[PDB]
Amino acid sequence: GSHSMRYFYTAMSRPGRGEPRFIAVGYVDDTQFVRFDSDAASPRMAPRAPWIEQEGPEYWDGETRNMKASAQTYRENLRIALRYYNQSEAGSHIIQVMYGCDVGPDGRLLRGHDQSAYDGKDYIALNEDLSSWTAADTAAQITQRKWEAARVAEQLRAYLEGLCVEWLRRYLENGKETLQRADPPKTHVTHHPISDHEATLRCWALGFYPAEITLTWQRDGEDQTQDTELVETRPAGDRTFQKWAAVVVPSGEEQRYTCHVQHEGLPKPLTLRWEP
């Protein structure tokens, strides 16, 4: 269906321990394909997916130069941020940035993104119109003023509508065997008595891609949202993901519970129960 390309920058200051660390990663959907770490012995944009390896020296050199330049830029931004928040130079701080594009099945731009955070909180974000900004506080309003004067949003829009989409489509074509393949979950229900009158039912989903999935427990056909323990979707390490949902049920009432699984790789939503 639809796809996304996303770049994530993290800039971490560390006074007394050198210049701020700059780490960048690139994702197509839930698949990482590039990385950069300024702390590496030889900092370069490096491949993390097999389908990006075919790109030539011009690509990798260009990307490496962008990452070094960006590292410089955000090292400056950390100092600027120190000034905007009246903070000392002795403390450690973090700037985060995520930007990129969503395209639909037809490969046309669904929407663009360019949002940043300072110390884990919203700072400034490019609005969906790709022409205006949302600033989270008065510090970010200064940046907003600066960027409105410099028409930065137009450059960002030019990137998000152009190169971002085109290169995303390129990646989607080169990595079609994986990027355009959904792996459905392998599902099953486990049963563990916790006492003579209560038992845990746990609905497992394993080995699915992409990460987006819905697991819900129903009792007598009714959603048990507020009584269901849901763990965070986790990476298995082989590109696929895992998740489970658990509910505590009265002994003898297990069959009144059904687990419902929704995933892109499934032709239709799945229903399963404990099979003693």
Binding site: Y7, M45, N66, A69, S70, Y159, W167
Partner: peptide, 10 residues
């Protein structure tokens, strides 16, 4: 491909 169009500061 990352955006190069960056030297824009806060």
């Amino acid at each position: 491909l990352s955006d190069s169009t960056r030297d824009v500061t806060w």
